[PDB]
Amino acid sequence: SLWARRENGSVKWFCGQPVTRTDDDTVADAKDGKEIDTKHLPSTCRDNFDAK
Amino acid sequence: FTLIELMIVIAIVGILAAVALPAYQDYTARAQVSEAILLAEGQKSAVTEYYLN
């Protein structure tokens, strides 16, 4: 998943394992078992649900 | 009285195997190690990328 965050006037994007959006400024691990394994993800797509 | 050609030639092939024994035994080991090396490599990729990233 790719998700963004309000920077206020702009946003910043993240890339990582599947996530769900909770509120307009918060997402969480779409923990379920179908996430692409960390070993297969680029160094640029290792973001965690709470990355800021 | 006679039969020594069969006796010596069976005993030269016997000693030939004994001389060919250590040659095949390090050529052999040296061959089994050359693979440990191939199995070790090809994993350089993962390690290299992990480090550079």
Side-chain angles (χ1 to χ4, degrees):
Chain A
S1 310
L2 262 36
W3 66 99
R5 192 149 186 163
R6 167 79 186 306
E7 273 197 64
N8 304 295
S10 64
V11 306
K12 176 166 82 149
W13 286 90
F14 302 104
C15 183
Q17 291 187 301
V19 66
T20 302
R21 179 169 287 292
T22 284
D23 64 22
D24 275 48
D25 184 55
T26 311
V27 296
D29 275 355
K31 74 299 140 60
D32 78 323
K34 331 257 269 60
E35 57 274 336
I36 294 177
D37 303 270
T38 306
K39 55 175 293 199
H40 305 297
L41 292 161
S43 204
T44 63
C45 194
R46 300 304 192 77
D47 300 313
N48 288 155
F49 74 94
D50 57 5
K52 184 217 158 295
Chain B
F1 62 123
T2 39
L3 206 83
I4 211 160
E5 224 93 294
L6 192 81
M7 197 177 73
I8 293 172
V9 175
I10 199 76
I12 60 160
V13 173
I15 65 161
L16 199 79
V19 175
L21 226 286
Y24 199 61
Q25 243 55 234
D26 280 335
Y27 179 71
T28 272
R30 195 183 309 120
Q32 319 173 303
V33 174
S34 297
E35 291 317 274
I37 294 179
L38 232 300
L39 225 189
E41 306 165 294
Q43 306 214 289
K44 286 162 64 171
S45 169
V47 173
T48 290
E49 237 49 354
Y50 190 108
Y51 183 75
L52 267 20
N53 280 169

Short mmCIF file of all heavy atoms in Angstrom, two decimals, chain A residues 3-40:
data_model
loop_
_atom_site.label_atom_id
_atom_site.label_comp_id
_atom_site.label_asym_id
_atom_site.label_seq_id
_atom_site.Cartn_x
_atom_site.Cartn_y
_atom_site.Cartn_z
N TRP A 3 0.17 5.29 1.02
CA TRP A 3 -0.79 6.14 1.69
C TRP A 3 -0.08 7.42 1.96
O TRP A 3 1.14 7.48 1.92
CB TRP A 3 -1.25 5.50 2.99
CG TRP A 3 -0.20 5.37 4.02
CD1 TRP A 3 0.02 6.20 5.09
CD2 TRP A 3 0.79 4.33 4.11
NE1 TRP A 3 1.07 5.74 5.84
CE2 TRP A 3 1.57 4.59 5.27
CE3 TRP A 3 1.08 3.20 3.33
CZ2 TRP A 3 2.62 3.77 5.66
CZ3 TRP A 3 2.13 2.38 3.71
CH2 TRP A 3 2.89 2.67 4.88
N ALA A 4 -0.84 8.47 2.22
CA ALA A 4 -0.21 9.75 2.45
C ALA A 4 -0.63 10.35 3.76
O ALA A 4 -1.49 9.82 4.47
CB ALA A 4 -0.54 10.70 1.31
N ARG A 5 -0.03 11.49 4.07
CA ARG A 5 -0.33 12.18 5.30
C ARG A 5 -0.37 13.66 5.05
O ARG A 5 0.44 14.20 4.30
CB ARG A 5 0.75 11.84 6.33
CG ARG A 5 0.42 12.25 7.72
CD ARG A 5 1.06 11.30 8.71
NE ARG A 5 0.65 11.58 10.07
CZ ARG A 5 0.79 10.73 11.08
NH1 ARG A 5 1.33 9.54 10.87
NH2 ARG A 5 0.38 11.08 12.30
N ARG A 6 -1.32 14.32 5.68
CA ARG A 6 -1.47 15.77 5.55
C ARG A 6 -0.23 16.46 6.09
O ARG A 6 0.15 16.25 7.24
CB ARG A 6 -2.69 16.23 6.34
CG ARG A 6 -2.79 17.73 6.55
CD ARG A 6 -3.33 18.43 5.31
NE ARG A 6 -3.30 19.89 5.43
CZ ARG A 6 -3.84 20.58 6.43
NH1 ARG A 6 -4.47 19.95 7.42
NH2 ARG A 6 -3.76 21.91 6.44
N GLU A 7 0.42 17.27 5.27
CA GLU A 7 1.57 18.01 5.74
C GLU A 7 1.07 19.40 6.08
O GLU A 7 1.76 20.18 6.75
CB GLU A 7 2.64 18.11 4.67
CG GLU A 7 3.61 16.95 4.64
CD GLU A 7 4.86 17.30 3.88
OE1 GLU A 7 5.58 18.20 4.34
OE2 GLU A 7 5.11 16.68 2.82
N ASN A 8 -0.14 19.69 5.62
CA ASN A 8 -0.79 20.99 5.80
C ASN A 8 -0.31 21.87 4.66
O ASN A 8 0.73 22.52 4.74
CB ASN A 8 -0.40 21.57 7.16
CG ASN A 8 -0.73 20.62 8.30
OD1 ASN A 8 -1.90 20.34 8.56
ND2 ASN A 8 0.30 20.12 8.97
N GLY A 9 -1.08 21.86 3.58
CA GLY A 9 -0.71 22.64 2.40
C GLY A 9 -0.14 21.70 1.35
O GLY A 9 0.00 22.05 0.18
N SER A 10 0.20 20.50 1.79
CA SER A 10 0.75 19.46 0.92
C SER A 10 0.69 18.14 1.71
O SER A 10 0.30 18.13 2.87
CB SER A 10 2.19 19.78 0.55
OG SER A 10 3.03 19.79 1.69
N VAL A 11 1.08 17.05 1.06
CA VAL A 11 1.09 15.76 1.73
C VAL A 11 2.40 15.03 1.43
O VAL A 11 3.11 15.38 0.50
CB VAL A 11 -0.11 14.84 1.28
CG1 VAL A 11 -1.42 15.57 1.45
CG2 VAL A 11 0.07 14.39 -0.16
N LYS A 12 2.71 14.03 2.25
CA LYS A 12 3.89 13.22 2.04
C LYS A 12 3.44 11.76 1.87
O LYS A 12 2.56 11.28 2.60
CB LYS A 12 4.85 13.31 3.22
CG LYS A 12 6.04 12.38 3.03
CD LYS A 12 7.20 12.65 3.97
CE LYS A 12 6.99 12.01 5.32
NZ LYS A 12 8.32 11.64 5.89
N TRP A 13 4.05 11.06 0.92
CA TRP A 13 3.67 9.67 0.67
C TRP A 13 4.58 8.61 1.29
O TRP A 13 5.79 8.78 1.43
CB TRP A 13 3.57 9.41 -0.83
CG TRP A 13 2.34 9.99 -1.46
CD1 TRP A 13 2.21 11.23 -2.01
CD2 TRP A 13 1.08 9.34 -1.63
NE1 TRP A 13 0.95 11.39 -2.53
CE2 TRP A 13 0.23 10.25 -2.31
CE3 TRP A 13 0.58 8.08 -1.29
CZ2 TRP A 13 -1.08 9.93 -2.65
CZ3 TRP A 13 -0.74 7.76 -1.63
CH2 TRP A 13 -1.55 8.69 -2.31
N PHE A 14 3.96 7.49 1.63
CA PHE A 14 4.67 6.37 2.23
C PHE A 14 4.41 5.16 1.36
O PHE A 14 3.46 5.14 0.59
CB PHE A 14 4.15 6.13 3.65
CG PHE A 14 4.28 7.32 4.54
CD1 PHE A 14 3.17 8.09 4.86
CD2 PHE A 14 5.53 7.71 5.01
CE1 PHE A 14 3.30 9.24 5.63
CE2 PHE A 14 5.67 8.87 5.78
CZ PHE A 14 4.55 9.63 6.09
N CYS A 15 5.27 4.16 1.49
CA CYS A 15 5.16 2.94 0.71
C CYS A 15 5.55 1.78 1.61
O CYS A 15 6.61 1.81 2.24
CB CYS A 15 6.10 3.00 -0.49
SG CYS A 15 6.02 1.57 -1.62
N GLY A 16 4.71 0.76 1.68
CA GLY A 16 5.03 -0.37 2.52
C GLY A 16 4.02 -1.50 2.45
O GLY A 16 3.37 -1.68 1.44
N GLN A 17 3.92 -2.26 3.53
CA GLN A 17 2.99 -3.38 3.59
C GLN A 17 1.58 -2.86 3.83
O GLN A 17 1.40 -1.92 4.59
CB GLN A 17 3.40 -4.36 4.69
CG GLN A 17 4.68 -5.08 4.38
CD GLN A 17 4.98 -6.14 5.39
OE1 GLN A 17 5.10 -5.86 6.58
NE2 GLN A 17 5.09 -7.39 4.94
N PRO A 18 0.58 -3.50 3.20
CA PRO A 18 -0.84 -3.14 3.29
C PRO A 18 -1.27 -2.43 4.55
O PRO A 18 -0.89 -2.83 5.65
CB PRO A 18 -1.55 -4.48 3.13
CG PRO A 18 -0.65 -5.19 2.18
CD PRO A 18 0.73 -4.89 2.73
N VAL A 19 -2.06 -1.38 4.39
CA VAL A 19 -2.55 -0.62 5.53
C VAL A 19 -3.99 -0.19 5.29
O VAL A 19 -4.47 -0.14 4.16
CB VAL A 19 -1.64 0.61 5.78
CG1 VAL A 19 -1.74 1.60 4.63
CG2 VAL A 19 -2.03 1.27 7.07
N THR A 20 -4.71 0.12 6.37
CA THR A 20 -6.09 0.55 6.26
C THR A 20 -6.16 1.96 6.80
O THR A 20 -5.40 2.29 7.69
CB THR A 20 -7.02 -0.32 7.13
OG1 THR A 20 -6.89 -1.69 6.75
CG2 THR A 20 -8.48 0.12 6.99
N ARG A 21 -7.04 2.81 6.28
CA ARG A 21 -7.12 4.14 6.85
C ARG A 21 -8.16 4.17 7.97
O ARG A 21 -9.27 3.66 7.83
CB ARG A 21 -7.46 5.21 5.80
CG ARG A 21 -7.56 6.62 6.42
CD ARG A 21 -7.63 7.74 5.38
NE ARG A 21 -6.36 7.97 4.71
CZ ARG A 21 -5.27 8.46 5.29
NH1 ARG A 21 -5.28 8.79 6.58
NH2 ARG A 21 -4.16 8.62 4.60
N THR A 22 -7.78 4.76 9.09
CA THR A 22 -8.65 4.88 10.23
C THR A 22 -9.32 6.24 10.15
O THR A 22 -10.53 6.32 9.90
CB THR A 22 -7.86 4.74 11.53
OG1 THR A 22 -7.54 3.36 11.73
CG2 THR A 22 -8.66 5.23 12.71
N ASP A 23 -8.55 7.29 10.35
CA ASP A 23 -9.07 8.65 10.24
C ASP A 23 -8.26 9.40 9.16
O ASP A 23 -7.30 8.85 8.61
CB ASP A 23 -9.02 9.35 11.59
CG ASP A 23 -7.61 9.54 12.11
OD1 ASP A 23 -6.66 9.53 11.30
OD2 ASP A 23 -7.46 9.73 13.33
N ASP A 24 -8.63 10.64 8.87
CA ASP A 24 -7.95 11.37 7.80
C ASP A 24 -6.45 11.52 7.95
O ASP A 24 -5.75 11.90 7.01
CB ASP A 24 -8.60 12.75 7.61
CG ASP A 24 -9.82 12.70 6.67
OD1 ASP A 24 -10.69 11.82 6.86
OD2 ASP A 24 -9.91 13.55 5.74
N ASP A 25 -5.93 11.19 9.12
CA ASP A 25 -4.50 11.31 9.32
C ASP A 25 -3.93 10.11 10.07
O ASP A 25 -2.93 10.22 10.78
CB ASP A 25 -4.22 12.60 10.07
CG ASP A 25 -2.75 12.85 10.26
OD1 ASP A 25 -2.02 12.86 9.24
OD2 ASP A 25 -2.33 13.03 11.42
N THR A 26 -4.54 8.95 9.88
CA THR A 26 -4.09 7.75 10.55
C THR A 26 -4.54 6.49 9.84
O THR A 26 -5.71 6.35 9.49
CB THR A 26 -4.63 7.68 12.00
OG1 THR A 26 -4.39 8.92 12.68
CG2 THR A 26 -3.94 6.56 12.75
N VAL A 27 -3.60 5.58 9.64
CA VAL A 27 -3.85 4.30 8.99
C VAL A 27 -3.29 3.22 9.91
O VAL A 27 -2.65 3.54 10.90
CB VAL A 27 -3.15 4.22 7.62
CG1 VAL A 27 -3.73 5.27 6.67
CG2 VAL A 27 -1.64 4.40 7.80
N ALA A 28 -3.53 1.96 9.60
CA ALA A 28 -3.02 0.86 10.43
C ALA A 28 -2.82 -0.39 9.62
O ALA A 28 -3.43 -0.55 8.56
CB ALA A 28 -3.98 0.58 11.57
N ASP A 29 -1.95 -1.26 10.11
CA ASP A 29 -1.64 -2.49 9.43
C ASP A 29 -2.89 -3.26 9.05
O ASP A 29 -3.74 -3.52 9.90
CB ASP A 29 -0.77 -3.39 10.31
CG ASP A 29 0.70 -3.08 10.20
OD1 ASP A 29 1.09 -2.22 9.37
OD2 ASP A 29 1.49 -3.70 10.94
N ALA A 30 -3.01 -3.59 7.78
CA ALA A 30 -4.13 -4.36 7.32
C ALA A 30 -3.68 -5.79 7.60
O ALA A 30 -3.63 -6.62 6.69
CB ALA A 30 -4.34 -4.16 5.83
N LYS A 31 -3.32 -6.05 8.86
CA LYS A 31 -2.86 -7.38 9.28
C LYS A 31 -3.87 -8.44 8.87
O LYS A 31 -5.02 -8.43 9.33
CB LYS A 31 -2.65 -7.42 10.79
CG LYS A 31 -3.94 -7.45 11.60
CD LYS A 31 -4.79 -6.22 11.34
CE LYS A 31 -6.28 -6.55 11.24
NZ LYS A 31 -6.83 -7.19 12.47
N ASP A 32 -3.46 -9.37 8.02
CA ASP A 32 -4.38 -10.40 7.57
C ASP A 32 -3.66 -11.61 6.97
O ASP A 32 -4.26 -12.67 6.81
CB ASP A 32 -5.36 -9.81 6.55
CG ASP A 32 -4.75 -9.66 5.17
OD1 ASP A 32 -3.55 -9.32 5.09
OD2 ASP A 32 -5.47 -9.88 4.18
N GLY A 33 -2.38 -11.43 6.63
CA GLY A 33 -1.61 -12.53 6.06
C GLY A 33 -1.28 -12.49 4.58
O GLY A 33 -0.56 -13.36 4.09
N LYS A 34 -1.79 -11.51 3.85
CA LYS A 34 -1.52 -11.42 2.42
C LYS A 34 -0.52 -10.30 2.05
O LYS A 34 -0.40 -9.91 0.88
CB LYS A 34 -2.85 -11.23 1.70
CG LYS A 34 -4.02 -11.86 2.45
CD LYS A 34 -4.49 -13.17 1.85
CE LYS A 34 -5.58 -12.95 0.82
NZ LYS A 34 -5.14 -12.09 -0.32
N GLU A 35 0.21 -9.80 3.03
CA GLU A 35 1.19 -8.76 2.77
C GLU A 35 2.44 -9.30 2.10
O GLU A 35 2.91 -10.38 2.45
CB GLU A 35 1.62 -8.08 4.07
CG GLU A 35 2.18 -9.04 5.10
CD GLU A 35 1.09 -9.67 5.95
OE1 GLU A 35 0.00 -9.08 6.08
OE2 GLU A 35 1.35 -10.76 6.51
N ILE A 36 2.97 -8.56 1.13
CA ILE A 36 4.19 -8.99 0.47
C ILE A 36 5.28 -8.92 1.54
O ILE A 36 5.44 -7.92 2.22
CB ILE A 36 4.58 -8.06 -0.68
CG1 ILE A 36 3.53 -8.14 -1.78
CG2 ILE A 36 5.93 -8.45 -1.21
CD1 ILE A 36 3.78 -7.18 -2.96
N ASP A 37 6.02 -10.02 1.67
CA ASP A 37 7.09 -10.20 2.63
C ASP A 37 8.18 -9.15 2.54
O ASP A 37 8.66 -8.82 1.46
CB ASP A 37 7.67 -11.59 2.41
CG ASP A 37 6.61 -12.66 2.54
OD1 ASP A 37 6.42 -13.15 3.66
OD2 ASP A 37 5.94 -12.98 1.52
N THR A 38 8.59 -8.63 3.69
CA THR A 38 9.63 -7.60 3.71
C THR A 38 10.81 -7.86 2.76
O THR A 38 11.32 -6.94 2.14
CB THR A 38 10.20 -7.41 5.13
OG1 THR A 38 9.13 -7.14 6.04
CG2 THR A 38 11.18 -6.26 5.16
N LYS A 39 11.23 -9.11 2.65
CA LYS A 39 12.37 -9.41 1.79
C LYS A 39 12.15 -9.03 0.33
O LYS A 39 13.12 -8.78 -0.39
CB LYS A 39 12.76 -10.89 1.88
CG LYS A 39 11.62 -11.86 1.60
CD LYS A 39 12.09 -13.31 1.60
CE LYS A 39 13.03 -13.59 0.43
NZ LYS A 39 13.13 -15.06 0.13
N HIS A 40 10.90 -8.96 -0.11
CA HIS A 40 10.61 -8.63 -1.50
C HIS A 40 10.39 -7.14 -1.74
O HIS A 40 10.22 -6.71 -2.88
CB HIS A 40 9.38 -9.40 -1.97
CG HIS A 40 9.50 -10.88 -1.78
ND1 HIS A 40 10.46 -11.63 -2.41
CD2 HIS A 40 8.86 -11.73 -0.93
CE1 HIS A 40 10.41 -12.87 -1.97
NE2 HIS A 40 9.45 -12.96 -1.07
#
